[PDB]
Design an enzyme around this catalytic site. Structure first.
Site, short mmCIF file in Angstrom:
data_model
loop_
_atom_site.label_atom_id
_atom_site.label_comp_id
_atom_site.label_asym_id
_atom_site.label_seq_id
_atom_site.Cartn_x
_atom_site.Cartn_y
_atom_site.Cartn_z
N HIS A 102 38.70 18.79 -16.38
CA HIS A 102 40.05 18.71 -15.85
C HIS A 102 40.79 20.04 -15.97
CE1 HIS A 102 43.86 17.01 -14.65
NE2 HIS A 102 44.40 17.49 -15.75
N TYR A 112 55.58 11.18 -14.73
CA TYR A 112 54.86 9.94 -14.48
C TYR A 112 55.78 8.75 -14.23
CZ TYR A 112 50.67 12.25 -16.35
OH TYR A 112 49.62 13.11 -16.57
N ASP A 130 46.85 19.51 -11.06
CA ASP A 130 47.29 18.26 -11.69
C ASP A 130 48.60 17.82 -11.04
OD1 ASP A 130 46.68 16.39 -14.08
OD2 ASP A 130 48.77 17.02 -14.40
F1 LIG Z 1 42.56 14.06 -19.99
C1 LIG Z 1 43.54 14.05 -19.04
C2 LIG Z 1 44.80 14.58 -19.34
C3 LIG Z 1 45.80 14.57 -18.38
C4 LIG Z 1 45.54 14.03 -17.12
C5 LIG Z 1 46.65 14.02 -16.07
C6 LIG Z 1 46.18 13.55 -14.70
N1 LIG Z 1 47.32 12.98 -14.00
C7 LIG Z 1 47.71 13.79 -12.86
C8 LIG Z 1 48.24 12.84 -11.80
C9 LIG Z 1 48.05 13.08 -10.45
C10 LIG Z 1 48.55 12.16 -9.54
C11 LIG Z 1 49.24 11.03 -9.96
O1 LIG Z 1 49.75 10.11 -9.03
C12 LIG Z 1 48.97 8.94 -9.00
C13 LIG Z 1 49.44 7.79 -9.61
C14 LIG Z 1 48.67 6.64 -9.58
C15 LIG Z 1 47.45 6.62 -8.94
C16 LIG Z 1 46.98 7.77 -8.32
C17 LIG Z 1 47.74 8.93 -8.35
C18 LIG Z 1 49.42 10.81 -11.31
C19 LIG Z 1 48.92 11.71 -12.23
C20 LIG Z 1 44.29 13.51 -16.83
C21 LIG Z 1 43.29 13.52 -17.79
#
Ligand SMILES: Fc1ccc(CCNCc2ccc(Oc3ccccc3)cc2)cc1
Ligand SMILES: Fc1ccc(CCNCc2ccc(Oc3ccccc3)cc2)cc1
Lengths: 319, 319
Positions: free
Chosen positions: B296, B238, B107
């Site tokens: 996930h 984030y 993640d």
């Molecule tokens: F049910 C769930 C619970 C938690 C999550 C967290 C997933 N988030 C991880 C992540 C990985 C890269 C990231 O950077 C970006 C930002 C914008 C566009 C593309 C990539 C932003 C977040 C997901 C599903």
């Protein structure tokens, strides 16, 4: 030689029993080397060895032994017998997931690593002691008889009854460590006039000078640590002579089979080199080191020499 | 598979900056493997991997990432940008005396280990990510434009303004983690109806059921940890999209040269496998793993499979 700044280290904590947790400092990658200080010291006593061993390719774990520093200091005197201390170090390895480690000790720490090698050779890759020799327990000679034999060991009698030596050692800690941490030629103590004329520091300067071995800053670090738990816990390492004797007797008739190093100090006038004279008959694979002009506080006194002896021995017998 | 009891672990602490100290759990000997969890997790998310990797011959360091658990949670939002986070992990290695380590993340942790591999390959023996792919920064596409493109990424907009998502996530922590830590077939969240209809849990059960992936005891451990610092620090990972974007742009035109593993999860409906489609052109020595029936929360969902993939890859590309 490179030393350590305490706040720039990685600090580890392991719970070996309900109210007992051991603290250590960790640096490097490679085979595990566990360093066990003596009385009245600290992981900081290995400050010149820790970065040298790590740089030579070893993962160093420098202990605060039980009763010291950031490690727990349980109140009971029997918590400090060698049987309990060694099994806690075995639990320590278990909790870290280490099948074995090299053990290096000095003073009481050197006694502990000898008994780790003797009762838990399976968990000891290799063992090294500075100053402290391994003499097999004599089941016909009580501990009091042998202490009250050689006169230099009379300070251990003054250390027996709880509260007495604690008071003298804690009354001014800066004086205590400045009086102890000295080269042989600067020594202000007669460890034999101990028990019939006051105590350890009765005929010592009230404001002793600063030994060439140490700065004021390093004295104050020891001072700061022994403000946490005091001298009781450290002193309790002396107050189980008879139990250590009975436990040690349960092993009579066995040799230490693992790679081993004994390092003697020419000017250590209590743990004299000659006390190690016949460890070869009990330890067949024993190597030796010997340091001239070196008093009791070996790691502080001759840091370069000890670094060369340990690294030379680790690279040929531990790896 | 063997898990961890938290109190039976060795706990390490390292100060990487004046008011920032990182906490980790350590077990095993051999090459260093650093594990970096995601949002909103903990070193405990690796509980099925830690004893397996150690048993395979590795020294495991499972991080509490900054903002989490026993690691410091500074208040400033910019303390959680990738540039700061990565250099703190470099300092971490420095303080432990480690020339390099293997980095494995999931993640947000997987994003961090990709950028460790990209800006500090000298310090990264090998890198592995679960779910999180490495997509090079597009210097022509602002982060808001790309988030407000794919609709599944709209929960990140709800996470932007401080205080809003913290309130929903902290109001009942047992409900928060029981609602998140679920297999794909048990999912109670629509991560897209997020920002125009309440929040994350508005149409979720008030007392959700316990996923087959977890016991009540494991839920309460996460609950206990996020009572220390709350959700602000984790949410701040984030809230630096634009700075991460500018920093990532400063590296455009370079490939990741070190051994690398990308592990995709069939049922991760946000970090979908296809988002990794062309990482080969940027990472020439990339190996792949893929896990069917895996959502996930990969380490909890399919622990046996991830253990086999990592150990198989470590023994051939990291050693
Ligand atoms: F049910 C769930 C619970 C938690 C999550 C967290 C997933 N988030 C991880 C992540 C990985 C890269 C990231 O950077 C970006 C930002 C914008 C566009 C593309 C990539 C932003 C977040 C997901 C599903
Ligand atoms: F200036 C100083 C300051 C501190 C010390 C401490 C030395 N004590 C270490 C030690 C090693 C083994 C021991 O076990 C016995 C017990 C009885 C007889 C023979 C061995 C007892 C103590 C020495 C000089």
């Amino acid at each position: 030689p490179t030393s350590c700044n305490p706040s720039d280290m990685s600090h580890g904590y392991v719970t070996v029993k309900p109210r007992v947790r051991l603290h250590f400092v960790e640096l490097g990658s490679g085979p595990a080397v566990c360093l066990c200080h003596g009385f009245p010291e600290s992981w900081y006593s290995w400050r010149y060895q820790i970065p040298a061993l790590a740089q030579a390719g070893y993962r160093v774990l420098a202990m605060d032994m039980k009763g010291y520093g950031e490690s727990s200091a349980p109140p009971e005197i029997e918590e400090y017998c060698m049987e309990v201390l060694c099994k806690e170090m075995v639990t320590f390895l278990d909790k870290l997931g280490l099948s074995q480690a090299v053990f290096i000790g000095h003073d009481w720490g050197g006694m502990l690593v000898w008994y780790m090698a003797l009762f838990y050779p399976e968990r000891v890759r290799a063992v090294a002691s500075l100053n402290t020799p391994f003499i097999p327990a004599n089941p016909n000679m009580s501990p009091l008889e042998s202490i009250k034999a050689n006169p230099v060991f009379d300070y251990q009698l003054y250390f027996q009854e709880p509260g007495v030596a604690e008071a003298e050692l804690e009354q001014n800690l800066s004086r205590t460590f400045k009086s102890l941490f000295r080269a042989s030629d600067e020594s202000v103590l007669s460890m034999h006039k101990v028990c019939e004329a006051g105590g350890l520091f009765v005929n010592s300067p009230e404001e002793p000078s600063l030994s060439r071995m140490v700065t004021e800053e390093e004295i104050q670090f020891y001072v700061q640590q022994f403000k946490k738990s005091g001298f009781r816990g450290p002193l309790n390492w002396y107050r189980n002579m008879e139990r250590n004797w009975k436990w040690a007797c349960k092993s009579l008739g066995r040799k230490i089979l693992i790679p081993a190093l004994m390092v003697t100090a020419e000017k250590d006038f209590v743990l004299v080199p000659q006390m190690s004279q016949h460890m070869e008959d009990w330890i067949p694979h024993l190597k030796r080191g010997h340091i001239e002009d070196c008093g009791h506080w070996t790691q502080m006194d001759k840091p370069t020499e000890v670094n060369q002896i340990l690294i030379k021995w680790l690279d040929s017998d531990a790896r």
